[PDB]
User: Fold this.
Amino acid sequence: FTGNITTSYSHTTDNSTAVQDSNGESWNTGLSINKGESAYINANVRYYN
Amino acid sequence: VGVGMENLIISTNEHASSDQGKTVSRATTNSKTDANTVGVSISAGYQNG
Assistant:
């Protein structure tokens, strides 16, 4: 009939370093319109007599 | 002389816009770490003594 009791203690010290490099590109397109004055009209006309 | 109105037209002066965008990016990371651990353990028991 065997038995055993164990007690343990541990201490850990850690140091770390890190370097990150990032590059990115972006492309946007946009379109806006006014609902009051949306377009202009030109009329080609001739007079008669 | 009198004036009569036959039609009324409303043009709303609201501004509407739409935008579309795309993005691409790349990141690179390098990490370096060191760790140290010290441990002490005590055990006592009965195994044929």
About this structure: The longest strand of chain A covers residues 3-34. The interface with chain B takes residues 1-37 of chain A (CB under 8 Å). Chain A has no helices and one strand. The beta strands of chain A are 3-34.
